[PDB]
Amino acid sequence: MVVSIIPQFPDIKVSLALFEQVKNAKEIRSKMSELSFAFIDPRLVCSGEQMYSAIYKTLIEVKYNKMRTRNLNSECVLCLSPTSNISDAFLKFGIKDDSSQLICLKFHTNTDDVDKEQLRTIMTSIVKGQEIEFNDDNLSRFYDEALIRKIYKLSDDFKPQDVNGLSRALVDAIQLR
Amino acid sequence: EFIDKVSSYLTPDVDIAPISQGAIVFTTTTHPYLPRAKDSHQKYIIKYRPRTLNESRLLAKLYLIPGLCVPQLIACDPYNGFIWLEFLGEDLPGGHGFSNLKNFLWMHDQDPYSDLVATTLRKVGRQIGLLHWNDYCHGDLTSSNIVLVRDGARWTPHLIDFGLGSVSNLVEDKGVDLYVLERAILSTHSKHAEKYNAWIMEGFEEVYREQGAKGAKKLKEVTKRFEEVRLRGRKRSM
Ligand SMILES: Nc1ncnc2c1ncn2[C@@H]1O[C@H](COP(=O)(O)OP(=O)(O)O)[C@@H](O)[C@H]1O
Ligand SMILES: [Mg+2]
């Protein structure tokens, strides 16, 4: 797992973890309310840059505009989206009953240090699957470009040579609201 | 004052160095959201404007157009007026300055008749041709708003500063864009200024001529208007 900070927001830490061979996505979704984490569908996340750009947008929105959803975790799922409809974002970017991978995201607002051992214990009690490193090498395994193009409404004329090129277009969509 | 508010907004975590004031432009070595050492570039641009929305939307749209070279939009805070951009260009050797078109031209002004200069200027015209073919206007097309990015022994022109940019299929807007650049290049009073403009126009025309019969027609329209703009751009006894 990785624990990170956005430079202009030193007191907010975000933990990100990536799981493969996930067996209980349906169960996770059923219990989601009554757990706080966001469970994100990696088929729509092609890079760290994309994910971190949404985390940035989340903090900007909440600090300087308005929070639309329940907490930072859900707000970030919204901010990953190209559109303003909350339900659509949760549906498209949240895990699905058939998800075999997931990103587990959590904002930590307490100024204190994140308790990493407890955090890992909590995640593994929720997720039946195998954690792998949250990095671009592993994210490049699971993103679905075709689905991404459809969801982010990218034209067939747009033909990025590599993942960096694709990531740039998604960050654009994220930053523009 | 402006430096106070900006450094407070960014916090001491983010280093800044002012490079232009008016709407202040800074450079920073700090990526706005990738974990430290997980980014891929030495520095970035921060534009602060207490146009922000306009430039961001246009940068995003233009990136998706094949062949158009513009800075990456990295981050946008429209509530406070900040945009973070990819830093394009570099210092020319021998203290000739930042690698915008203006400085490149000055550096080569004593001996401009080379493949490097001609090819580079044609590439500048290609960028403007792509922009206009796709019905966008720059709005402030000076030699300072065209940045050369080194590519080995070659230079790759990029367009920057889209604060006044717009979507437009009007040949009048296209003609004025071309005229602004033409006059900016002529402004140096260089004995070679007309040649520079000719190389640029060659690049522009090639883009249109690559679009078959439709391109040739639209090019005739644009060039006709451009000449009218030139006529209307100089004193006449009405
Ligand atoms: N993407 C960029 N890469 C490098 N330098 C840039 C970039 N964008 C802007 N600049 C610098 O900032 C200057 C623009 O500053 P300024 O005149 O204050 O505002 P405006 O951008 O309205 O003209 C450019 O001349 C250029 O030197
Ligand atoms: Mg500028």
Side-chain angles (χ1 to χ4, degrees), chain A residues 3-25 27-30 32 35-42 44-62 64-69 71-92:
Chain A
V3 178
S4 304
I5 290 166
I6 304 305
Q8 65 194 85
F9 299 101
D11 291 327
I12 298 175
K13 307 92 182 292
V14 180
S15 61
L16 287 164
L18 180 58
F19 290 82
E20 64 179 16
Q21 294 300 336
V22 174
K23 307 302 190 188
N24 71 327
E27 174 200 359
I28 293 174
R29 292 186 71 250
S30 74
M32 236 160 218
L35 260 11
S36 181
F37 294 90
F39 299 91
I40 293 169
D41 186 345
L44 280 176
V45 182
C46 73
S47 72
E49 177 192 38
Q50 178 193 359
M51 186 71 251
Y52 284 110
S53 88
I55 288 159
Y56 166 89
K57 175 62 68 176
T58 296
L59 297 180
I60 292 302
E61 285 291 329
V62 169
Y64 302 113
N65 191 29
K66 320 172 202 288
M67 194 170 65
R68 305 302 183 170
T69 72
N71 63 26
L72 299 175
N73 296 330
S74 49
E75 200 75 8
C76 191
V77 182
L78 174 57
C79 286
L80 261 180
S81 172
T83 103
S84 69
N85 188 270
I86 294 168
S87 290
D88 186 57
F90 290 170
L91 186 54
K92 288 169 175 168

Side-chain angles (χ1 to χ4, degrees), chain B residues 77-101 103-149 151:
Chain B
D77 176 357
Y79 313 112
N80 294 290
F82 289 87
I83 73 183
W84 305 56
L85 301 179
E86 167 185 22
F87 186 95
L88 299 178
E90 64 191 46
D91 289 322
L92 298 167
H96 292 289
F98 173 67
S99 65
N100 58 29
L101 179 58
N103 291 340
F104 172 84
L105 287 182
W106 195 242
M107 170 177 182
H108 293 286
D109 199 44
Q110 291 302 313
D111 66 327
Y113 288 104
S114 66
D115 277 340
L116 181 60
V117 174
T119 292
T120 299
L121 277 283
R122 293 189 184 117
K123 282 192 278 196
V124 170
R126 278 197 65 87
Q127 286 300 296
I128 306 163
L130 287 167
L131 187 73
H132 289 174
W133 175 251
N134 282 281
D135 289 323
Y136 293 95
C137 281
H138 183 278
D140 190 27
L141 204 52
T142 67
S143 57
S144 291
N145 284 335
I146 297 165
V147 171
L148 307 178
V149 172
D151 171 40

Side-chain angles (χ1 to χ4, degrees), chain A residues 114-116 119-132 134-149:
Chain A
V114 168
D115 186 343
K116 300 173 186 176
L119 185 52
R120 286 191 194 94
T121 291
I122 295 174
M123 287 192 304
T124 53
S125 85
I126 290 169
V127 181
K128 186 164 154 47
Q130 313 307 134
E131 191 186 0
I132 58 180
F134 188 91
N135 62 27
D136 282 358
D137 282 350
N138 291 327
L139 291 173
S140 74
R141 302 180 193 285
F142 304 115
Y143 74 83
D144 185 333
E145 184 178 351
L147 186 52
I148 286 172
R149 288 173 170 278

Side-chain angles (χ1 to χ4, degrees), chain B residues 19-20 23 25 45 47 71 86-88 98 144 160-161:
Chain B
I19 59 167
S20 193
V25 180
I45 285 288
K47 277 214 202 176
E86 167 185 22
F87 186 95
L88 299 178
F98 173 67
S144 291
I160 67 160
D161 292 341

